[PDB]
Design a protein around this ligand. Sequence first.
Ligand SMILES: Cn1ncc(C(=O)Nc2ccn3cc(-c4ccccc4)nc3n2)c1C(=O)N1CCC1
Ligand SMILES: [Mg+2]
Ligand SMILES: [Zn+2]
Length: 313
Amino acid sequence: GLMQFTLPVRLCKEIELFHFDIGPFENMWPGIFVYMVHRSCGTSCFELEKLCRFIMSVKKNYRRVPYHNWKHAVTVAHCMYAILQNNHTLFTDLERKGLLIACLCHDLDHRGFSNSYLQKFDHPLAALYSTSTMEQHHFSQTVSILQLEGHNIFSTLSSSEYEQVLEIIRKAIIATDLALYFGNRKQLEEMYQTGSLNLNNQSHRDRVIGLMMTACDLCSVTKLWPVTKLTANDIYAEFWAEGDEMKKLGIQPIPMMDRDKKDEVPQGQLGFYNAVAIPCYTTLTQILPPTEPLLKACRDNLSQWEKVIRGEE
Ligand SMILES: Cn1ncc(C(=O)Nc2ccn3cc(-c4ccccc4)nc3n2)c1C(=O)N1CCC1
Ligand SMILES: [Mg+2]
Ligand SMILES: [Zn+2]
């Protein structure tokens, strides 16, 4: 009960900042997550025995893929932690509990392939879940882990609080489907500008939590340039593997996934920052002003990709 996690001084300070990198020491990541739950949620939110056993079962069910791995889960949970800490009074006790767990679980059992590859491969998951294929699977896997004996970190919630938290986690994980992001942000953009955005309207909170989930999911683009640049390698390593597997099905993949068109990566990243990342953190910054450092880091990194193209790096 009186057992805090404490981090070394450098981590204790940097962890509060949006651009924190969780480091290459895998065995520190669980403690970093528990640290973040204790400060964000309270030391009483979860039985430490059950949290520790939930965390390690979640770790076991991430695969050794170049990008959609246990490191990504913890990275995405830290971005959510930074947003929650910088927006203290905007979120219910239940939302803080649910969203850190949602981020940790949001890519459970990822195979390193897109929903489109599952559909063209004709994977059994594509027959079980026609849209948001992997994301419905990630929530499925989350519920399964929660139902393992001794792994139910929500056991001390009332029946209705339990149903609400699982509903927050389900919508949160589904929103990480980037196909749903475009319409979600357009709607949030209209609502913000016409002044109809109401955080007491549950349907409105849902859209805002969805944008937060997209923002955390993409948070690789908000780190310092050397972290962003080296993460890009992991991202493209998966894309090019998928491109190879498209060619094995007799389908020319999109250039993003074709390892023969590496040359075009700098222009492809430009399109992604302008079409997805900048709009995402701009709308987020309008709704939640203290998230501005994420938009600022994203712009710095846009400018770094512009420098790569101009041959300057
Ligand atoms: C992980 N994640 N999740 C979704 C996406 C995504 O769609 N990104 C893209 C989108 C469009 N592109 C096209 C080309 C491309 C490359 C070479 C040649 C021709 C075209 N490169 C692109 N990359 C990403 C991503 O890139 N990152 C960075 C942070 C998340
Ligand atoms: Mg995903
Ligand atoms: Zn993800």
